[PDB]
Write a protein that binds this ligand. Structure first.
Ligand SMILES: Cc1oc(S(=O)(=O)NC[C@H]2O[C@H](O)[C@H](NC(=O)c3cccc(Br)c3)[C@@H](O)[C@@H]2O)cc1C(=O)O
Ligand SMILES: Cc1oc(S(=O)(=O)NC[C@H]2O[C@H](O)[C@H](NC(=O)c3cccc(Br)c3)[C@@H](O)[C@@H]2O)cc1C(=O)O
Length: 880
């Protein structure tokens, strides 16, 4: 019944979950104030960047030194870290004294000397090792190696002191707060640990934070640990409705009035004192001890945090309260001991609840940063309150987990403390460096020197000459097909042309209208039709009847029903083409089972189907390959365009060639367009020394192994498969995705050209790269985004440079034909990669300018077809 009296008396010290979530939201605002640039200088929670960029992944290894300086004593540690799988650290340490005599230079001279004794005593003085520092307060820190004590940089001092000895030398330095060392130690055993926590004589906490939220450090990429210094929460008044008169009293009787106010609520230094003030006051009000007081009860610090831990710890704590009160000089009754015991619980429970509230906000922010619904997270924990107070860890654990239902949160107590932590920072720093040059060693295989592309250019040369002559054209991989397109535009052409573009299950039927003369141009009308799955699995004669009405329908839908026209034809399928108007289907592709086609002339197939529709009677002028149509299409814009190019789900190219050089066609006078089928470049082995294991792996798993090898380096779904195979390799090697391969990352096809283009065009915080990686079902961590964006940029650059080297041959092979030097030529280009990719165009233009300096090459975009150039080759065929 004295419990309820205390409860009602101390009511403002018993915090409802409501109050705690409100306090949690308040802390969230303070975190944003300290992180933001304009609000940081007056923010009470400083949110200091630690410059620690990553937690441990468990494979850290090496030997490391550290110093922990508290004053009047300090330790020098040697930390041996092995990657054997056990994550078992090896330590030795030694304590040295700093007498009152030990001027700055004298002090660090003494420190370097001890460190020198320690290294000699320890065998290691010929070794040059990293050195961590740990401090129990903040300094002013602009980089891992720096801090100003606030009067000078302590790293410069210890380094210049080492230089004056000449004994040993020291490697990279890190200076970290003791919360940070706690997090780092725990994160070496548990790699979900993103939060250091200390509830000690003092209290503070740190966490990993995303660089896009840290204004005070340049750059938006990745993460950095933030030392919150949350002891100062409420220094500006934010907590003053939670804080009581006892809280106020402690603050005025403190060495630092008005500072560290949240600490003064929750930590062990003031915790017992805060209980004394309640006893003094209740007694002065005659609610305890019959009003009597003792000289010791009114002396500060005489009731100790240790006494709280005792009183709640023993099964009889009323007896242990009787004894503490007696030592204070009082004569307690049973009630007085009941009330004392309970006051101890209320105070210690408030400390545990206030930690929960602010831990809740940190957990919530890490959760919104990662952006999933559920969060596995571990809190590295240290300090004398949470370790040696009997019930408080339980109370903290239970309250945190209530306040964050969305989180599975482990607690792990750090034993060995802050010595290894600073050491572990330098160990993780070495690991980041090793993994960087590791994955850069793989990427170097995909970065080609200007001398290497010239060699690739050369081999495109020989393979072109080889395909044109009649001797090797059977053996040549680049087949150099004659198109029988012998002429290019004038301003002359005028009329209406139909284009039938058929490959895959949906053809388009298009009407092309040409306005001659300067200005003028072309407009399009298409319509898309589907070939039903029956029609495609049936006979070929019912296939082209279905085709022919879709022409009849659209001609009518143009309003033109009943008019005869000339017609160009895009038939995308393996073909032997013997004449402009004649082509033989070799193999069906794309899913067409239609009988009576392979081995037949596709135009007679189409023409005999036009005879049968009783009205129809249209004229079939030409059969074309889609690159040829691309070249022709911007020939109407630019008369100087001799070359087509498509970079897309596939890649191909064509130029106008001297008929002297085409030996598969009788007669040497004039020029003829050559459809290279240059995706087949490299299928004889000529690129085999540029093909990585990743190229080889894409090749073996496609529909057409050993075939179209150059197309698979420069374009298609193949780029994202190259990317994926690299990413899998990095992950097997521990270099990405923390060494664990999703079944979803083993899914072939997931990296799609549209995604390689957005990934590469994203900057700053890479939110769009992470978004895509979430979309595809992959780990999205900031660190992972950078790497993935890098792999994409490398792969897409090689594709553009390789495309440049080969397109460089073509413009010289046009030039050596004519014996010329400086040429202005223009290339019509189509295809989705080149239009939509951010850097692909520019890189290839640069590549062509670099490896063909004598040629001056413009690239004009064409598009529209492909299938539309089919009617424009007809306009120039209806020429004669
Ligand atoms: C293991 C252990 O560590 C300690 S501790 O008290 O030495 N370190 C905890 C935190 O204490 C303070 O809050 C520090 N801030 C300041 O002093 C500070 C000073 C000025 C301005 C500002 Br703003 C902050 C924090 O930086 C520090 O992390 C006790 C124990 C134990 O076992 O009892
Ligand atoms: C506008 C655009 O066009 C395309 S595309 O894929 O239709 N054209 C590129 C090339 O594809 C392959 O390389 C073709 N060769 C063969 O398959 C081939 C031909 C003969 C034998 C063997 Br064995 C293979 C070439 O004829 C064709 O030029 C994609 C896009 C886009 O924007 O994504």
């Amino acid at each position: 019944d004295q419990v309820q009296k205390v409860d009602q008396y101390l009511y403002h010290m018993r915090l409802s979950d409501e109050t705690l979530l409100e306090i949690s939201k308040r802390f969230r605002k303070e975190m944003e104030k300290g992180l933001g640039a304009t609000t940081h200088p007056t923010a009470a929670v400083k949110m200091l960047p630690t410059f620690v960029r990553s937690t441990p992944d468990g494979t850290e290894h090496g030997e490391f030194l550290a110093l922990d300086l508290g004053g009047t004593n300090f330790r020098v540690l040697w930390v041996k870290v092995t990657d054997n799988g056990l994550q078992k650290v090896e330590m030795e340490n030694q304590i040295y004294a700093i007498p009152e005599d030990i001027s700055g230079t004298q002090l660090f001279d003494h420190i370097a000397e001890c460190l020198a004794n320690f290294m000699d005593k320890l065998q290691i003085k010929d070794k040059k090792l990293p050195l961590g520092f740990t401090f129990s307060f903040p300094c002013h820190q602009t980089k891992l190696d720096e801090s100003f004590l606030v009067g000078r940089d302590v790293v410069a001092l210890i380094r210049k002191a080492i230089q004056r000895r000449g004994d040993f030398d020291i490697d990279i330095v890190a200076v970290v707060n003791d919360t940070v060392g706690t997090m780092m130690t725990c994160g070496y055993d548990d790699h979900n640990c993103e939060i250091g926590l200390i509830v000690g004589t003092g209290s503070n906490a740190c966490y990993m934070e995303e660089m896009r939220h840290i204004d005070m450090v340049e750059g938006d990429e990745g993460r950095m640990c933030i030392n919150m210094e949350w002891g100062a929460f409420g220094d500006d008044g934010s907590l003053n409705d939670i804080r009581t008169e006892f809280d106020q009293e402690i603050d005025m009787g403190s060495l630092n009035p008005g500072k560290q106010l949240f600490e003064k609520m929750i930590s062990g230094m003031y915790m017992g004192e805060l209980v004394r003030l309640i006893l003094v006051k209740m007694a002065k009000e005659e609610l305890l001890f019959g009003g009597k007081l003792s000289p010791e009860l009114l002396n500060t610090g005489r009731f100790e945090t240790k006494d709280i831990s005792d009183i709640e710890g023993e099964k009889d704590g009323i007896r242990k309260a009787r004894e503490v009160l007696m030592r204070l000089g009082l004569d307690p009754t049973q009630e007085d001991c009941v009330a004392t015991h309970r006051i101890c619980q209320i105070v210690s429970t408030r400390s545990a609840s206030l930690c929960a509230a602010t831990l809740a906000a940190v957990l919530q922010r890490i959760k919104e940063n990662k952006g999933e619904e559920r969060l596995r997270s571990t809190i590295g924990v240290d300090g004398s309150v949470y370790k040696k107070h009997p019930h408080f860890a339980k109370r903290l654990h239970k309250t945190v987990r209530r306040l964050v239902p969305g989180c599975d949160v482990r607690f792990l107590r750090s034993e060995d403390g802050s010595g290894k932590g600073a050491a572990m920072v330098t160990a993780v720093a070495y690991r980041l460096a090793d993994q960087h040059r590791a994955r850069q060693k793989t990427l170097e295989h995909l970065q080609l020197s200007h001398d290497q592309l010239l060699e690739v250019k050369r081999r495109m040369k020989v393979e072109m000459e080889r395909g044109l002559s009649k001797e090797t054209h059977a053996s040549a991989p680049v087949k150099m097909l004659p198109t029988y397109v012998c002429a290019t535009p004038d301003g002359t052409e005028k009329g209406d042309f139909l284009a039938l573009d058929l490959g895959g299950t949906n053809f388009r039927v298009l009407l092309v209208r040409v306005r001659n003369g300067k200005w003028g141009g072309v407009e399009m009308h298409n319509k898309i039709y589907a070939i039903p799955q029956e029609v495609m699995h049936g006979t070929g004669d019912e296939l082209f009847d279905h085709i022919v009405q879709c022409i009849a329908d659209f001609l009518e839908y143009m309003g033109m029903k009943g008019v005869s026209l000339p017609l160009g034809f895009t038939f995308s399928f393996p073909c032997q083409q013997n004449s402009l108007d004649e082509s033989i289907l070799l193999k069906w592709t794309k899913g067409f089972k239609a009988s009576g086609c392979e081995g037949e002339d596709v135009v007679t197939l189409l023409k005999e189907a036009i005879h049968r529709r009783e009205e129809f009677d249209l004229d079939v002028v030409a059969v074309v390959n889609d690159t040829v149509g691309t070249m022709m299409t911007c020939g109407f814009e630019d008369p100087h365009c001799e070359v087509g190019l498509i970079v897309g789900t596939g890649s191909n190219a064509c130029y106008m060639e001297e008929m002297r050089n085409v030996e598969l066609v009788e007669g040497e006078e004039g020029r003829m367009c050559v459809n290279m089928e240059w995706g087949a470049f490299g299928d004889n082995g000529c690129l085999d020394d540029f093909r990585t294991e990743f190229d080889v792996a894409v090749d073996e798993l496609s529909l057409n192994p050993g075939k179209q090898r150059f197309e698979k380096m420069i374009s298609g779904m193949y780029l994202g498969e190259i990317v994926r195979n690299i990413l899998i390799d990095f992950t097997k090697r521990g270099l990405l995705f923390r060494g664990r391969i999703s079944e979803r990352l083993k899914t072939r096809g997931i990296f799609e050209t549209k995604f390689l283009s957005q990934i590469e065009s994203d900057c700053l915080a890479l939110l769009q790269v992470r978004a895509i990686l979430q979309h595809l079902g992959l780990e999205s961590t900031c660190d992972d985004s950078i790497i993935v964006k890098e792999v994409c940029t490398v792969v897409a650059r090689r594709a553009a440079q390789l495309c440049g080297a080969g397109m460089a041959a073509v413009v010289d092979r046009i030039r050596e034909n004519r014996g010329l030097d400086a040429l202005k030529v223009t290339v019509g280009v189509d295809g989705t990669l080149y239009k939509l990719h951010p850097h692909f165009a520019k890189v290839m233009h640069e590549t062509v300018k670099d490896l063909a300096p004598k040629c001056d090459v413009s690239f004009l975009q064409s598009e529209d077809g492909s299938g539309k150039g089919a009617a424009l080759i007809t306009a120039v065929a209806c020429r004669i």
